[PDB]
Structures are given as structure tokens and as C-alpha cells.
Design a protein around this ligand. Structure first.
Ligand SMILES: COc1ccc(S(=O)(=O)N(C[C@H]2CCC(=O)N2)C[C@@H](O)[C@H](Cc2ccccc2)NC(=O)O[C@@H]2C[C@@H]3CCO[C@@H]3C2)cc1
Ligand SMILES: [Cl-]
Ligand SMILES: [Cl-]
Ligand SMILES: [Cl-]
Ligand code: NA
Ligand code: NA
Lengths: 99, 99
């Protein structure tokens, strides 16, 4: 699709068999997901957003569908206003910005 | 242009007579610029994201040249770690996300 930006670019994602809403976020390096159960081991990461740094749990090689497009990659779990799909997965689904 | 997302989508902007680097950010409702003076009236606001909230000054009817494209709208100014072009101005330059 071609997504205009008059409204927030919210899509449905599927992770762990569950559908969730997420924001397509070109200003995010990383994909940040609200607290949920994911398989496997995690490693620590600090991410710096608009209000400061926070600790998140980094899970690698997680299967995730984004607006019907398949991705497998890193997700970080921690406190976020909304699930955000960042560039690490936007590149997997072939997203570009165009003007 | 078509901008891929392998790297942060940074562009040069001109605001208040000043050149700056800013992120084209589909996950940002508002355009957020680091501390600078702008003409006219303002009013305070809080904006929030990962790590919490910051206090900003909201200025309305500000013109910004974004990668050569002029756009007018509200700009908020405060202690952001990065300059952000949000959806309120991305729409005006006809930016879309495509995949
Ligand atoms: C009301 O207007 C706004 C409100 C908040 C923001 S935000 O900068 O907090 N943010 C909002 C996103 C995240 C939460 C949400 O609902 N939408 C814009 C983001 O693009 C932000 C933009 C951003 C803010 C501060 C630093 C760098 C980028 N990036 C971000 O938080 O990315 C996180 C932090 C990590 C650094 C970059 O990637 C990592 C993942 C911008 C305008
Ligand atoms: Cl990844
Ligand atoms: Cl506006
Ligand atoms: Cl349009
Ligand atoms: Na867990
Ligand atoms: Na004004």
C-alpha cells in the first residue's frame, strides 16, 4: 500500500499468534512492543526516546507479521505508549518514504 | 525522492533562518525542534513518548523548508534529543509510506 499521514499509520501485526495494533514509525530504529510473553532468551538494551532512556528486553529472531507482510527479527519489550514498528522491520517489509 | 530506511531518514530543513538536520518521522504527531527562538506567540504543552514527557513551547503558523519543500504549520520547541518532522508537516509535502 501507499499510506498517507493525515491519520496515525496504525496497522495490525501478529506476534505469538495474537493480533495487535502497531504504529509504523520511521523515527524508530528499533521495534518496541508492550509487555507480552515471547520465547527464548533476552538480552538487555537501553533505548533513548523523547523523554529519556529506558531499559528494555531484546528478543532476537522473532516471527512477526506486519500488515500481512512476514518479518523475522529483533523486538524489544518495554513501556511504550503504543507498539511501534521501527526501521529494523520496516526494511524487511520493503517500506520506503516517498515525496 | 524515495528514501529507504536502512539508515535514519535525516534531511536538511530551514526554520527561523537556520539550517538543521531533522528526522522524517511517521510515528510523530507533531514537529518537534530543539531549543531555538521563533517569532510570535506560543503556549506550553507536554508531549510524551518512550522515557516519558517533555515540556515544549507551541508556535503556530511557522514555515519550514523540508528538503526543499515548504510547509506551514505548528512547531513545538523544547529539549528533544533529535529534531523531528512529524505528520502535521509530512502531509503537507505529500509524504507517504509505501510497501
Ligand atoms: C505529539 O507529538 C509527538 C509526540 C511524541 C514524539 S516521540 O519523539 O516520542 N515519538 C513518538 C512515537 C514513539 C511512541 C509513539 O506513540 N509514537 C516519535 C518516535 O519516532 C521517536 C523519535 C525519536 C525521539 C528521541 C530520540 C530519537 C528519535 N522514536 C523513538 O522513540 O524510537 C525509540 C527510541 C530509540 C531511539 C530511536 O529508535 C529507538 C526506538 C514526537 C512527537
Ligand atoms: Cl532485526
Ligand atoms: Cl499543524
Ligand atoms: Cl494526500
Ligand atoms: Na517472558
Ligand atoms: Na505564530
Amino acid at each position: 500500500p501507499q499510506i498517507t499521514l493525515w491519520k496515525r499509520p496504525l496497522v495490525t501485526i501478529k506476534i505469538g499468534g495474537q493480533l495487535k495494533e502497531a504504529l509504523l514509525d520511521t523515527g524508530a530504529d528499533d521495534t518496541v512492543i508492550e509487555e507480552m510473553s515471547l520465547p527464548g532468551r533476552w538480552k538487555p538494551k537501553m533505548i533513548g526516546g523523547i523523554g529519556g532512556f529506558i531499559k528494555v528486553r531484546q528478543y532476537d529472531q522473532i516471527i512477526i507479521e506486519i500488515a500481512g507482510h512476514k518479518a523475522i527479527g529483533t523486538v524489544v519489550v518495554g513501556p511504550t505508549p503504543v507498539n511501534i514498528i521501527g526501521r529494523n522491520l520496516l526494511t524487511q517489509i520493503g517500506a520506503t518514504l516517498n515525496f
